[PDB]
Design a binder for this molecule. Structure first.
Ligand SMILES: N[C@@H]1[C@@H](O)[C@H](O[C@@H]2O[C@H](CO)[C@@H](O[C@@H]3O[C@H](CO)[C@@H](O[C@@H]4O[C@H](CO)[C@@H](O)[C@H](O)[C@H]4N)[C@H](O)[C@H]3N)[C@H](O)[C@H]2N)[C@@H](CO)O[C@H]1O
Ligand SMILES: C[As](C)(=O)[O-]
Ligand SMILES: [Zn+2]
Ligand SMILES: [Zn+2]
Ligand SMILES: [Zn+2]
Ligand SMILES: [Zn+2]
Ligand SMILES: [Zn+2]
Ligand SMILES: [Zn+2]
Length: 259
């Protein structure tokens, strides 16, 4: 089948118009993101993913591991995901509070965190049932774009970089470690990575800076973070910057055991 078939028509077109990348390229980026999040490449199965992974971020949800919030993530992306779901369901004044009411979940915003009073079995049971919900899937792509992809593509383009590998690597860093804010976010790592106009030189240095922190602060369990960055770095070394006609290379660089 065509890799394009893994996206809604609206998402396929929006990603092409706003990121320059096609369905094969985005499908490949998603395979590469999904490996360290779920230990497989079948990303389309994970819209309804929900789990408390005990990392002090609350519950982790969906394709990009949106979090509801906790002591290790006090500016989480999960509230925006829920607000976007409320909006996609037709709410006149969409909000995270409203999405949880709609879903029959006992929870609400407390500051910038979503406080969930339901048990994990109850909360995650309701989220799992959204796997095939069109409004949820729409909200999930809208939020992925708004929080991580738009900023990542802006940062690539401002350096003259447009390749699928560079955008993918920036997007993986942003969703894993945060887009903006602290030293380990995409913004913070870009600040440490210098000003080379050569895409290969720049990305090799960026990957090296990311490798120093990717297995810290519970972003990943070591050596899973080191291996996730190695995926992108190996693709740069291989010169496969466009992520087209790379099925065997993706199978190779994702061939690492998850701890
Ligand atoms: N264990 C993995 C999880 O770590 C991971 O979840 C993501 O974890 C990120 C790192 O803690 C977390 O980052 C947050 O990202 C947001 C959005 O970029 C940042 O929000 C910004 O914060 C600054 C101030 O610091 C504000 O100025 C901005 O307005 C605000 N948008 C947060 O600072 C940052 N902590 C992200 O939210 C989590 N979803 C998931 C996915 O890889 O996987 C787990 O395995
Ligand atoms: C595909 As494997 C990491 O179990 O060799
Ligand atoms: Zn558990
Ligand atoms: Zn817990
Ligand atoms: Zn923000
Ligand atoms: Zn290398
Ligand atoms: Zn080949
Ligand atoms: Zn294995």
């Amino acid at each position: 089948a065509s890799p394009d078939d893994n996206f809604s028509p609206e998402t396929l077109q929006f990603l092409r118009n706003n990121t320059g990348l096609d369905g094969e390229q985005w499908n490949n980026i998603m395979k590469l993101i999904n490996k360290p999040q779920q230990d497989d490449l079948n990303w389309i199965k994970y819209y309804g993913y929900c789990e408390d992974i005990e990392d002090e971020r609350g519950y982790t949800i969906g394709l990009f591991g949106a979090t509801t919030g906790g002591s290790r993530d006090t500016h989480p992306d999960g509230p925006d995901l829920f607000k976007a779901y409320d909006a996609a369901k037709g709410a006149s004044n969409p909000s995270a509070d409203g999405a949880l009411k709609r879903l029959g979940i006992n929870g609400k915003m407390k500051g910038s965190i979503l406080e969930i009073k339901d048990s994990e079995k109850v909360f995650c049971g309701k989220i799992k049932k959204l796997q095939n919900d069109a409004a949820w899937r729409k909200a999930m792509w809208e939020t992925f774009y708004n929080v991580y992809i738009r900023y990542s593509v802006e940062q690539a383009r401002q350096r003259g970089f447009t390749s699928a590998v560079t955008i993918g690597s920036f997007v993986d860093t942003a969703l894993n470690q945060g887009a903006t804010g602290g030293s380990d976010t995409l913004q913070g790592l870009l600040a440490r990575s210098g000003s080379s106009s050569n895409e290969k030189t720049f990305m090799k240095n960026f990957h090296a800076k990311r490798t120093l922190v990717v297995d810290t602060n519970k972003y990943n369990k070591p050596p899973n973070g080191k291996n996730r960055v190695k995926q992108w770095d190996t693709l740069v070394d291989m010169g496969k910057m466009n992520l087209k006609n790379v099925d065997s290379e993706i199978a190779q660089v994702t061939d690492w055991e998850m701890k």
